[PDB]
Amino acid sequence: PDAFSGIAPGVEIISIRQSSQAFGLKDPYTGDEDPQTAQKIDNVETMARAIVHAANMGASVINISDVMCMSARNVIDQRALGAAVHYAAVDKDAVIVAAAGDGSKKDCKQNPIFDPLQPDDPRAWNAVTTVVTPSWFHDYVLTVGAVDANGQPLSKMSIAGPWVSISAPGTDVVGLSPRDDGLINAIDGPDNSLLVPAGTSFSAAIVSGVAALVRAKFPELSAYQIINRLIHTARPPARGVDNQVGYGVVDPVAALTWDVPKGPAEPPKQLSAPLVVPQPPA
């Protein structure tokens, strides 16, 4: 009667409400700081608290499908958020998955890609014009980009930063309905128009499910090792590494069965070899 089902029907999920557009401050005056920037500092501080709390609850996988876009200029001090991520990623061994952020939000702008004229940095960190946090901490967080149901990247809707590391589907979304007992496909927009959801916030969900299955089969591996198992098994883009999709498209069956080397990626020492010229006849 119904074909829908979750990626990992056996998991247990903890719900925490940390952000919402339906609520507002009931003393709008904010003083010295502009009311628009004043709200971002409140989100950064509240975000750090939620991550620490979720880790102490014992969660092994943390999914963050709501991220903040910020300009390269006028960047806010992340000190509290940086320390909270480290505590959860190292001392509590949690795997943190975050969405790359959608181009439809208020302040997200498209970042520049790799430049062949400057091989100094293959990811082009110096050209960044906008930052997405906590996705920014590429040493401890796995950022997921989006692709359509066929595999083509959604160039018009995902922010192509240097932190992007993997990608998964993000179209033809389906799910259970709030305020009812059935399934849904769209949401009422500002107008009477029936708006259809899509974007990276759903791609981060798919990878959160796959990560749960993998560290159910290999309970001995640490968080850092589980991430390497997913990255090395993805199907790569035409440049081997690309800011539009990271290392590639996720591949479940591969991550669960291939013999991925336990150490991090290392390049070869040297590429040349001697030519064995035949012995001349007398």
């Binding site: 080397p261 070869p268 040297q270 590429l271 040349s272 070899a273």
Partner: protein
């Protein structure tokens, strides 16, 4: 009906002597205009390449010692240059 029992074969195995057949291959094939890709396993005394063409196998250099790069490559008839 509450047990699978689908994994076991219906009769004893015909174990092939590896001393006679030291070569085995995984084979994948798809015909244009078909919805399914076929997978089969092959075994034999030597690689499944014609005895006359055995001389024109190409031996690659092997910079990557991690064991995930082949040693030899062969382009038989009906090969493909542009691939997705």
């Amino acid at each position: 009906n509450r047990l699978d029992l689908s994994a076991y074969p219906d009769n004893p195995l015909e174990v092939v002597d590896i001393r006679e057949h030291p070569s085995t291959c995984w084979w994948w094939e798809r015909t244009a205009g078909e919805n399914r890709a076929r997978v089969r396993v092959v075994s034999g005394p030597t690689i499944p390449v014609a005895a006359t063409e055995m001389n024109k196998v190409v031996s690659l250099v092997k910079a990557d010692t991690s064991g995930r790069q082949a040693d030899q490559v062969y382009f038989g008839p009906d090969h493909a240059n542009f691939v997705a």
